[PDB]
């Protein structure tokens, strides 16, 4: 079972990767389908969002490259038919807010298991499972711990299943960068420990995507637990200010106990419509980025990471004002890099 790769390399060409991608509608997802579609791969995108929302993905895929299937996580049968004819399964199912009808376990461990489980029954050559970086089975945030729980299980349902483990991602439409920039509405921008001792290493979304895609088309990655990290680390302080810097909005980093702040996250979490902050998110935000001692991701998988400052201008531009909208990054001052 395979498809000899013919063509010159662009759209309307063939690469031979038929791939179910269950959580494509996501920020990371959007990018994964982009490269897969650019390369000419056959992409099956399972969806449970309404057809109007899935429209953005149609255009990057060539005619007949993208197939959309109706799928429900609780219904095992839907996952069954999606992987019927795929040979690569990529799992990006994740959320930050435990929803009424889906718990962190479900979105991270429960569902992503059933999926790979079926994929095996199907006989998919490889499964790529994505879990957050620094995910201990004991990490504070229920999210991270639960994700850790999953990366274990799925091994047993699907052995030698690649497990890329990305850091918080930097990209347009990302949270890491937009969240902080959107603190503008808040007059003061709380920062636990005044934004210190939680060094963070962002990674451009594309780098992550390209990396993921390259995995699909490389035999070197099997059972590998890569870690796409980034080109430079940062104390949360510079990051926050830098953001506000490009956004050209004032910065008032205010110390507030994580204790009390976990409570603020609880407050937003209470909100019915997509809580903006999450008790877990808060914790995750402060969880310091771990140093790198694992299977190299970017570069190792073939893409050289892209510095944050380089593309930050595009992600944070929408947050500027009438005039600030015309400033460029090089007249602006890039913040210092703290490896710690």
């Amino acid at each position: 079972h395979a498809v000899i790769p013919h063509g010159k390399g662009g759209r309307s060409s063939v690469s031979g990767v038929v791939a179910t991608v269950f959580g494509a509608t996501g920020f990371l997802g959007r990018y994964v389908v982009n490269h897969l579609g650019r390369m000419g791969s056959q992409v099956i995108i399972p969806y449970r969002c309404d057809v109007y929302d899935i429209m953005h993905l149609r255009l990057m895929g060539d005619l007949g490259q993208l197939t959309f299937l109706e799928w429900d996580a609780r219904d095992k049968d839907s996952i069954r038919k999606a992987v019927q004819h795929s040979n690569v399964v990529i799992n990006l199912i994740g959320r930050e807010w435990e929803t009424r009808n889906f718990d962190f376990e479900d979105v991270f461990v429960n569902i992503p298991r059933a999926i790979a489980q079926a994929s095996k029954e199907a006989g998919v050559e490889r499964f790529i499972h994505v879990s957050h970086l620094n995910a201990s089975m004991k990490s504070s945030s229920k999210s991270l711990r639960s994700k850790a729980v999953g990366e274990k299980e799925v091994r047993s349902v699907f052995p030698e299943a690649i497990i890329i483990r990305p850091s918080d991602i930097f990209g347009r439409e990302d949270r890491f960068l937009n969240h902080f920039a959107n603190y503008r509405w808040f007059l003061a921008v709380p920062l636990v420990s005044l934004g210190f001792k939680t060094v963070k290493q962002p990674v451009y979304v594309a780098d992550v995507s390209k990396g993921i895609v390259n995995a699909t088309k490389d035999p070197d990655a099997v059972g590998k637990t890569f870690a796409f990290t980034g080109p430079n680390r940062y104390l949360l302080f510079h990051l926050v200010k830098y953001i506000f810097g490009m956004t050209h909005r004032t910065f008032i980093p205010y110390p507030l106990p994580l204790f009390v702040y976990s409570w603020i996250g609880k407050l937003f979490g209470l909100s019915p419509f997509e809580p903006w902050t999450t008790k877990d998110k808060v914790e995750r935000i402060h969880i310091s980025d771990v140093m790198p001692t694992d299977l190299p991701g970017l570069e190792d998988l073939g893409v050289q990471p892209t510095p944050l400052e380089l593309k930050s201008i595009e992600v944070l531009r929408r947050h500027r004002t009438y005039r600030w909208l015309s400033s460029e990054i090089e007249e602006t001052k890039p913040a210092k890099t703290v490896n710690y």
Partner: protein
């Protein structure tokens, strides 16, 4: 059979000599075709002079420029064949003055003689690449702002080399080398049997 009126064939032929004598210097060949039309062929240097005589001569007033075009015969050393078709509202008639221009040997501009040519000359530069000296503002008219290559040249691929699609990653329209999903089927149509010229 078309209703040819020899009355015309003669009168236009006679004018063709008239012009040939009046401007011995630039007219190389003058011929009245069977359709019954007339075409005075001029050296490229005679662009300004031959037109002006036709625009402003009592016995040949050719006030409006119907068209300025450039066939491209790749075999011909001078690739382009700029053809100017002109109309006489008074004496009622039309004459075509055609010159030859190579790719990097520019022709003079007649925007002075007829301002109609301001646009057509820009059209000839954009499609074929001939350049017109003394043109007020020569710049691509029909092709895209960043287009590279002159399209109507016989040596330019129909589909071209670039096509546009919207890319989400970059959230902006982006050229890519053309990749066609059904190439233009190039039917060979010429028959190996000719028709004995009448």
């Amino acid at each position: 059979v078309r209703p040819r009126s020899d009355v015309t064939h003669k009168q236009l032929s006679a004018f063709g000599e008239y012009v040939a004598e009046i401007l011995p210097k630039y007219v190389q060949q003058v011929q009245v075709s069977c359709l019954d039309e007339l075409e005075i062929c001029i050296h490229p240097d005679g662009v300004i002079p031959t037109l002006t005589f036709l625009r402003d001569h009592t016995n040949a007033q050719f006030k409006s420029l119907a068209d300025l075009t450039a066939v491209d015969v790749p075999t011909r050393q001078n690739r382009f064949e700029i053809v100017y078709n002109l109309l006489s509202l008074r004496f009622n008639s039309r004459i075509r003055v055609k010159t030859y221009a190579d790719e990097l040997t520019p022709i003079d501009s007649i925007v002075s003689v007829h301002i109609a040519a301001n646009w057509y000359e820009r059209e000839v530069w954009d499609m074929f690449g001939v350049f017109f000296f003394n043109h007020p503002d020569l710049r691509r008219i029909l092709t895209d702002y960043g287009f590279e290559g002159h399209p109507f040249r016989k040596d330019f691929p129909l589909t071209g080399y670039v096509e546009l699609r919207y890319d989400d990653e970059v959230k902006r329209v982006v050229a890519e080398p053309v990749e066609l999903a059904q190439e233009f089927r190039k039917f060979d149509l010429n028959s190996p049997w000719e028709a004995f010229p009448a």
